[PDB]
Write an enzyme that holds these catalytic residues in place. Structure first.
Site, PDB file in Angstrom:
ATOM      1  N   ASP A   1     -15.019 -13.711  -3.760  1.00 24.63           N
ATOM      2  CA  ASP A   1     -15.041 -14.852  -2.864  1.00 24.63           C
ATOM      3  C   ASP A   1     -15.793 -14.606  -1.575  1.00 24.63           C
ATOM      4  O   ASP A   1     -16.291 -15.537  -0.947  1.00 24.63           O
ATOM      5  CB  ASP A   1     -13.607 -15.260  -2.532  1.00 24.63           C
ATOM      6  CG  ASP A   1     -12.839 -15.656  -3.759  1.00 24.63           C
ATOM      7  OD1 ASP A   1     -13.155 -16.738  -4.298  1.00 24.63           O
ATOM      8  OD2 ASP A   1     -11.949 -14.916  -4.224  1.00 24.63           O
TER       9      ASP A   1
ATOM     10  N   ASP B   1       0.841  -1.197   0.000  1.00 26.71           N
ATOM     11  CA  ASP B   1       0.000   0.000   0.000  1.00 26.71           C
ATOM     12  C   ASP B   1       0.880   1.253   0.000  1.00 26.71           C
ATOM     13  O   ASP B   1       1.964   1.251  -0.606  1.00 26.71           O
ATOM     14  CB  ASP B   1      -0.963  -0.069   1.200  1.00 26.71           C
ATOM     15  CG  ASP B   1      -2.274   0.641   0.956  1.00 26.71           C
ATOM     16  OD1 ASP B   1      -3.311  -0.054   0.850  1.00 26.71           O
ATOM     17  OD2 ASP B   1      -2.275   1.885   0.917  1.00 26.71           O
TER      18      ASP B   1
ATOM     19  N   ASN C   1     -14.101  -0.358  -6.418  1.00 25.20           N
ATOM     20  CA  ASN C   1     -15.153   0.551  -5.977  1.00 25.20           C
ATOM     21  C   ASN C   1     -15.904   1.171  -7.146  1.00 25.20           C
ATOM     22  O   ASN C   1     -16.327   2.334  -7.090  1.00 25.20           O
ATOM     23  CB  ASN C   1     -14.591   1.662  -5.095  1.00 25.20           C
ATOM     24  CG  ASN C   1     -13.760   1.147  -3.961  1.00 25.20           C
ATOM     25  OD1 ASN C   1     -14.089   0.145  -3.331  1.00 25.20           O
ATOM     26  ND2 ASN C   1     -12.670   1.847  -3.675  1.00 25.20           N
TER      27      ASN C   1
END
Length: 279
Positions: free
Chosen positions: A200, A39, A161
């Site tokens: 999932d 990240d 998103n």
């Protein structure tokens, strides 16, 4: 163990019902596991990390999290107050710059870095990687995520998103990793969450309180926030010996709360991450 007045998402992961506020978990708390947060970095000095976070790699001039996103995600994995796995070891890999952006070639290098670097770390209970990032479909990005998983790391990735089918995004669309959608506190699919056959599992993703830079906290939303709930859950379950890196996504799906979410499109799983902890 019980943490009262927990963030709603922690309470949700240990409950058969929405609308409660205590997080219940085995006190082992992911001890002996490790989670890589790939990240913008981690502000490892935040008191919430208790010395359990460290940066292991950057591709930029600094390893500092100048954004906050990576610190927030790491907090949901493993901070003392905001984290699922409160005793895990957190390793930061800064593939995203301080604006939250990164080239796919750098992201790929970071995934291959983790596949090797775990051999330099002590993680007797297992290794997880949390990837709250993504872009358009790329076979090379998907292959890197597949290699990381194959190497013995439980890979959890954000679905994205776009309120769209995740098949068109990477690494979300890689079949062999754990692709995580987002839900809200009323067990609705988050309005922005991607969906589709490649998902999932869902985790809490709307209005998630966690750590932020400057020693602070804030609440933000995204499939980026759902992903570290699943990554932390995997680390927690691996410490308990209930599953392994290769099978943790399937185990989480097997043991999930089933049929609880609303506005799940036909053909997307209706599975919400759940620790099945009985106090």
């Amino acid at each position: 163990a019980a943490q009262t007045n927990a963030p709603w998402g922690l309470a949700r992961i240990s409950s058969t019902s929405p609308g409660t506020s205590t997080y219940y978990y085995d006190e082992s708390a992911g001890q002996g596991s490790c989670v890589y947060v790939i990240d913008t970095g981690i502000e490892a000095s935040h008191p919430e990390f208790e010395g359990r976070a460290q940066m292991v790699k950057t591709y930029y001039y600094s390893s500092r999290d100048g954004n906050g996103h990576g610190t927030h995600c790491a907090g949901t994995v493993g901070s003392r107050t905001y984290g699922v796995a409160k005793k895990t070891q957190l390793f930061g890999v800064k593939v995203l710059d301080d604006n939250g952006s990164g080239q796919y070639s750098t992201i790929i290098a970071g995934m291959d870095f983790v596949a090797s670097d775990k051999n330099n770390r002590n993680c007797p209970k297992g290794v997880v990687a949390s990837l709250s990032l993504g872009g358009g479909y790329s076979s090379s990005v998907n292959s890197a995520a597949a290699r990381l998983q194959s190497s013995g790391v439980m890979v959890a990735v954000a679905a994205g998103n776009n309120n769209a089918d995740a098949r068109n995004y990477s690494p979300a669309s890689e079949p062999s990793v754990c692709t995580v959608g987002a839900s809200d506190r009323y067990d609705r699919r988050s309005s922005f969450s991607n969906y589709g056959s490649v998902l999932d599992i869902f985790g809490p993703g709307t209005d998630i309180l966690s750590t932020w830079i400057g020693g602070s906290t804030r609440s933000i939303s995204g499939t980026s926030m759902a992903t570290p709930h699943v990554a932390g859950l995997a680390a927690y379950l691996m410490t308990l010996g209930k599953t392994t890196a290769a099978s943790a996504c399937r185990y989480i799906a097997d043991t999930a709360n089933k049929g609880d979410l609303s506005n799940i499109p036909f053909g997307t799983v209706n599975l919400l991450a759940y620790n099945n902890y009985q106090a």
